[PDB]
Design a protein around this ligand. Structure first.
Ligand SMILES: Cc1cc2nc3c(=O)[nH]c(=O)nc-3n(C[C@H](O)[C@H](O)[C@H](O)COP(=O)(O)O)c2cc1C
Length: 351
């Protein structure tokens, strides 16, 4: 009866409902290592046939810009993620690992040898902001990547995709949104390169398309999604022509025949052109209510809807939605704190 709670077939996966766990950075993977507490967390949010996306997961030793976000670039990361994946599988979840590199959204304190964060350009991020006291930028201005270094970062994503499979994930979500490394190349206010990776829409999408290319070759395009936010400007990532960026990307990922395109809504024409252009599954995110999502599903505006904050705060979100029970309030001050339990796995199920 309830459109959000109607099954849906995502390529070769059968989903019981359309209520997806959005990727949610929780900063509790000590030392970039996934922790057994995450096994409880994602397990609590699993339903048979539910689709879950992990928090963003680093592709390399320089992919990090916050403390305690997990990697999947070492054999060690692989082994620690296995029991988390298995717990999700035990309750019948389809579980995709979202893979990112923060690029310029970082500092020397997060980089090996204390070196500069890397980006498509050397454009400094929030220059008005310094750390407590020192006249020193909070976001250590980034090093512009040599074109000789770009294939060996695009390979970093190919390899993280490989290690996701090793850990047993069903698939991978490429984090091409929110002002991080992939979005940095795509956005015209950030990418001012005068080589083949910059200086034009096509040049600017070369990077993401190379990444999609290498991941889908590694693991199969049928296990590959990408997240885009062409309309956002998180971390100074706005585009002067966001409708064009969006359409060119959605159109351009058709060639590759990947599984899904997952897009964050603007401040609300926008998502539709991308949806009609992209032939596979479409996932919409950003400020959905139950009723917003029921409506988007029934009117064919999207196939799935990712909920981030409400799902964070309600381990049984899909059930609650099935029934319209009241939701737990989300406690913002513990989104990003570092306790294994508090504001992480102590949001309650329905009495
Ligand atoms: C605590 C917090 C962490 C997040 N971490 C990520 C991230 O790892 N990757 C990502 O693509 N989006 C991230 N998001 C965005 C969510 O996936 C989602 O798009 C956003 O919360 C808007 O959806 P909502 O209205 O359901 O909360 C995060 C959001 C919050 C609140």
């Amino acid at each position: 009866s309830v459109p959000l709670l109607t099954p849906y077939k995502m390529g070769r996966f059968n989903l019981s409902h359309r209520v997806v766990l959005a990727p949610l950075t929780r900063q509790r993977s000590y030392g970039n290592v996934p922790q057994p507490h995450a096994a409880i967390y994602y397990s609590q949010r699993t339903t048979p046939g539910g689709f879950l996306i992990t928090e963003a997961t680093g592709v390399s030793d320089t992919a990090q810009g916050y403390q305690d976000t997990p990697g999947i670039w070492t054999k060690e990361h692989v082994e620690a993620w296995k029991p988390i994946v298995d717990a999700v599988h035990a309750k019948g979840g389809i579980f995709f690992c979202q893979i990112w590199h923060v690029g310029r959204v970082s500092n020397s304190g997060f980089q090996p040898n204390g070196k500069a964060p890397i980006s498509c350009s050397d454009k400094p991020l929030m220059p008005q902001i310094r750390s407590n006291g020192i006249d020193e930028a909070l976001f250590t201005p980034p090093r512009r990547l040599g074109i000789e270094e770009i294939p060996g970062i695009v390979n970093d994503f190919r390899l993280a995709a490989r290690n996701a499979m090793e850990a047993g994930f069903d698939g991978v979500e490429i984090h091409g949104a929110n002002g991080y490394l992939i979005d940095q190349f795509m956005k015209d206010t950030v990418n001012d390169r005068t080589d083949e990776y910059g200086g034009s829409l096509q040049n600017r999408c070369k990077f993401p398309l190379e990444i999609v290319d290498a991941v889908a070759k590694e693991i199969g395009p049928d296990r590959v999604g990408i997240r885009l936010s062409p309309f956002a400007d998180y971390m100074e990532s706005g585009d002067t022509n966001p409708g064009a960026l969006g359409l060119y990307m959605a159109e351009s990922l058709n060639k590759y025949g990947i599984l899904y395109c997952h897009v964050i809504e603007a401040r609300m024409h926008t998502l539709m052109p991308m949806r009609k252009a992209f032939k596979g599954t479409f996932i919409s995110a950003g400020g959905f209510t139950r009723e917003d999502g029921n409506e988007a599903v029934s009117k064919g505006r999207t196939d799935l809807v990712a909920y981030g904050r409400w799902f964070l705060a309600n381990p049984d979100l899909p059930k609650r939605f099935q029934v319209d029970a009241p939701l737990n309030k989300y406690d913002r001050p513990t989104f990003y704190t570092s306790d294994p339990v508090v504001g992480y796995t102590d949001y309650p199920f329905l009495e």
